[PDB]
């Protein structure tokens, strides 16, 4: 059932991801240094990481079969509304359940709740982000499922402001059926048990997390002294 047009999509998406995700984390030395121990000590370093991550999510999104065919206005809308969510998803690769932190090579670049808290987010709103990473990590997705899930997330037709929703849906279905078919044919039991449905559930949880992120970014950015510490891409993508 794994049609050939589908194994191609997969190869495209894997190569895309390989070209936009360096598991060595070499580029992180360019970011403004991390500061642990005052207020918003971690903001400059994490603002840099996010902005970098947004760049990388854009390069990923551009290779999504079909994405090209959309209007530039639709591409922008899709990316603006998914960036944070794809960032949350792609972060799962560095997140570890051993101590509920994002381990990016070295202790300089190993981020936990306290660090995130020093980027202007209370420990309370950060917890659901952790619970999300935990439940996603437990799915133990294949790298193929991972990239499909990020692409499906980007091409969502219900994002506010979408013009050609019909075409977004057409592109997303192509990717959904690819994933559904991939799991049945390639993912053995019991890990495959309802694995699709659970993958789609994470897309629902991400909408919730997105909303919460927007609300919190609205409060943070409204303080011009904080917004000053962001990047121009973050201001443009997440808003000003």
């Amino acid at each position: 059932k794994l049609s050939e047009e589908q194994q191609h999509i997969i190869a495209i998406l894997l190569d895309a991801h390989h070209k936009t995700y360096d598991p060595t984390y070499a580029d992180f030395r360019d970011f403004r240094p991390p500061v642990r121990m005052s207020p918003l000590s971690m903001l400059p370093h994490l603002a840099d990481l996010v902005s970098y991550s947004i760049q990388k999510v854009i390069g990923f999104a551009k290779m999504i079969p079909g994405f090209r065919d959309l209007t530039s206005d639709d591409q922008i809308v899709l990316l603006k509304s998914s960036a944070i969510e794809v960032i949350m998803l792609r972060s799962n690769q560095s997140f570890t359940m051993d101590d509920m932190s994002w381990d990016c090579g070295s202790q300089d670049y190993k981020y936990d709740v306290t660090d995130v808290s020093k980027a202007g987010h209370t420990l309370e709103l950060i917890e659901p982000l952790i619970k999300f990473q935990v439940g996603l990590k437990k799915l133990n997705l294949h790298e193929e499922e991972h990239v499909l899930l990020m692409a499906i997330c980007i091409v969502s037709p219900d994002r506010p402001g979408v013009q050609d929703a019909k075409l977004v849906e057409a592109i997303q279905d192509r990717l959904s059926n690819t994933l559904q078919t991939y799991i049945r044919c390639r993912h053995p039991p019991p890990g495959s048990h309802q694995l699709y449905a659970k993958m789609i559930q994470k897309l629902a949880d991400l909408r919730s997390l997105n909303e919460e992120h927007s609300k919190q970014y609205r409060s943070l950015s409204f303080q011009p002294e904080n917004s000053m510490k962001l990047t121009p891409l973050v201001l443009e993508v997440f808003g000003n």
């Binding site: 760049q55 390069g59 551009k62 922008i76 121009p232 443009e236």
Partner: peptide, 11 residues
């Protein structure tokens, strides 16, 4: 908006 940075990273 008019986001020129995004549009440029998009192509």
């Amino acid at each position: 908006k008019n986001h020129p940075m995004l549009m440029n990273l998009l192509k």
